[model samples]
Target: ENVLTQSPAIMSASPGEKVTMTCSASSSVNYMHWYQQKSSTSPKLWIYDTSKLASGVPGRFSGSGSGNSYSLTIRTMEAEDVATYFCFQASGYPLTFGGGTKLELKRTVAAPSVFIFPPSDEQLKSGTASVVCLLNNFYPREAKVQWKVDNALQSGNSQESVTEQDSKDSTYSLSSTLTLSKADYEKHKVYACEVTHQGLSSPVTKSFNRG
Candidate 1:
């Protein structure tokens, strides 16, 4: 099976600036495909093979490089082009996608306001709890949410919502939920939500304590 790896998993640029992204394959590939996803919209194919632009795509967008390495370049970036891009390869059985690279537009923006909502008393008493972390009023609409229990990272029974843009201000909002058992919640009194984004110098965190 072929594997694809993307570099600079995240990038930020200003309008009219040039931007380039790269993808490397474990082995030689016959062709490469690039997709762009903006906010909550479905991904659209932007480049086919190594240098052909997909139908209807703008001329400023181009693809190059080949064999084990490939790249996508934007001659002049636009605010509307802010999105996450992924490279795909089908040179062998079972196609694969790169880990996706997020492109954010540089702007003077505020960090998201983080808020946590704990489970109800009844739910907590019933041996299960649902916790939600809300992020609001952020620009660029690209971010990652991570969960920690008692200062340790955790997975499973957790989900993050798609980023939604507010028409009034163009800022973004998103939510992440984590479900835990009563014993786990009690033992892990400190539940933290850490958000990673290009706009911040470091990941921002919010904590919820069990009552």
Candidate 2:
């Protein structure tokens, strides 16, 4: 089966900006189709063939190229255009997607601020406690949260919530919770939450020293 590879797996732009994405096929193909997918939504056809717009699509969206290469272009991006796009070929059987290219709105707001909340007094006395990490005011609504205990990586016993958007400001918030035993906390272990986001040059970390 032929394969398709997309360039710049991710991209970010502000509203009214222009954006272009490319997909290269392993083997030659006559045409390709493009799909757009928003958060928690089904993929929708945006472009069909080399230069046709899908039904109801805006005229600013276009597709071009043929053979082994194809391109998708947005003449003027809009806020609602923030989504992941995929390119695939139907010339052969067992279709495949080109990994996908995520289009995010550039961060014009502040970076994510992380806060760690310690367990309550009553919960501390029960030999079990919970630590919550809140990531606030992040843009793009995509990030990763990692937990560490005593500077060592630990898995499981952790849960993260879906990204919540503030429709008024276009910012996002997310929270992660980690459960630990009172004994672990009493040992003076260092619990840390590291958040990775496209807006940050490096991961932002917040640490809590068990009291």
Candidate 3:
């Protein structure tokens, strides 16, 4: 099961003008992992395998281009680094996600791409808290879910859904659900599931914590 698609979701740059992202894989894929999702929360794997560098993540955040076409470079761009950016592919194993790209605040001076979703020892008894973050074989439209507590930012009220399937190479499988309740899910901290869209290169957050 390997199928991923990512295109212009909504990118507007001007700081240094160097935003490039293109992850396409329906078959050949040995490595390609890049993550960065701010605002909505969760998602910080800054390149792996294909380019390595996932130990503290910094060094201007970079990932060289490779087979199947891969890129994630931001040498002189800031504004919190903007928001939205994702590209996953551990080769194959029920893993595939790409549909998000939203980097704004660019006219000259930029640098605001800060993503922090810490706090997970797993708690919340009695009250009720469920955690399930998954984005496999994504496709078609229908994605803009969210849920963040410890960091403050939960607004699903109790209704945000999307279901579809037809993956094999046919490309088609979108699933979304950001339901919240039970006192904001027991107040557990560091919960994320941001899957935005516009095309991709941004918005691909996936955090977990609920025990």
Candidate 4:
């Protein structure tokens, strides 16, 4: 039997709004864990064992409720918490996870596209691989971009005001660069580009490969 499942892969709620998630388990398990994935780095365990808070988690985040049905409550929302969230049951191996819920800061105009430019064919053989990721449609924005491998955090560069668009709707955008040696690139590891816009989902990740 499976341990967990989450509904509504994506969701949007306003600041201070109460959001609810339905986590169903095929069989009764002792406890359920909740995680938040922001900016595509890696999922951070938020709550475990039904209502217990993970170390370092803020009081605004709490989990409780009942069997087969549990909810994660965010007391007061913050832009940093606008990322995706998932519920997992540690009852057994192959720990399952919910798809993800994205909480976006309420806005009128849509955020710009997230663009990725990877090393070209000629660049690949040069032994150095790099990628540029950015959302070119935000203004007066505090956007943070990151690079990750597999699920581990790696070093990255951040640039602001690289490009700008009219702020009729108060938008933001930024870019992150990833540089790896030929040895790392040869391993065929999964590379993820994460973007975070203030008041938006913590961040979303787009992955790429040398092939």
Mind giving the per-residue lDDT tens digits that candidate 2 earns over 66-160?
Answer: 89999999999777777889998988877778999988776475678889998899998888988999998877677889988888876888988
Order of candidate numbers by lDDT, starting with the best: 2, 1, 4, 3
Write the candidate numbers in order of decreasing TM-score. Answer: 2, 1, 4, 3
The estimated TM-scores of all candidates read 0.58, 0.70, 0.22, 0.52
Query: Model 3: per-residue lDDT, tens digit, 10-29?
Result: 76565556777677776777
Clashing residue pairs found in predicted model 2 = none
In model 3, how large is the Cα lDDT of residue 69? 71
**Which 10 consecutive residues of model 3 have the lowest summed lDDT?**
108-117
C-alpha lDDT (0 to 100) for residue 201 of candidate 4: 53
Assess each prediction's global lDDT (C-alpha) against the native: 0.84, 0.84, 0.59, 0.68
Q: Specify the poorest-scoring 10-residue window by lDDT in model 2.
A: 162-171
Candidate 4 Cα errors over 4 Å, as ranges: 108-135, 138-211
In model 1, what is the error at residue 60, expressed in angstroms? 1.5
Q: Model 4: which ten-residue window has the lowest total lDDT?
A: 158-167
Q: Please, what are the lDDT tens digits per residue for candidate 1 over residues 59-158? A: 9999998789999999998767778999998878898999999887765576788898888898887889889999888876778898988898877779
Better of 1 and 3 by lDDT: 1
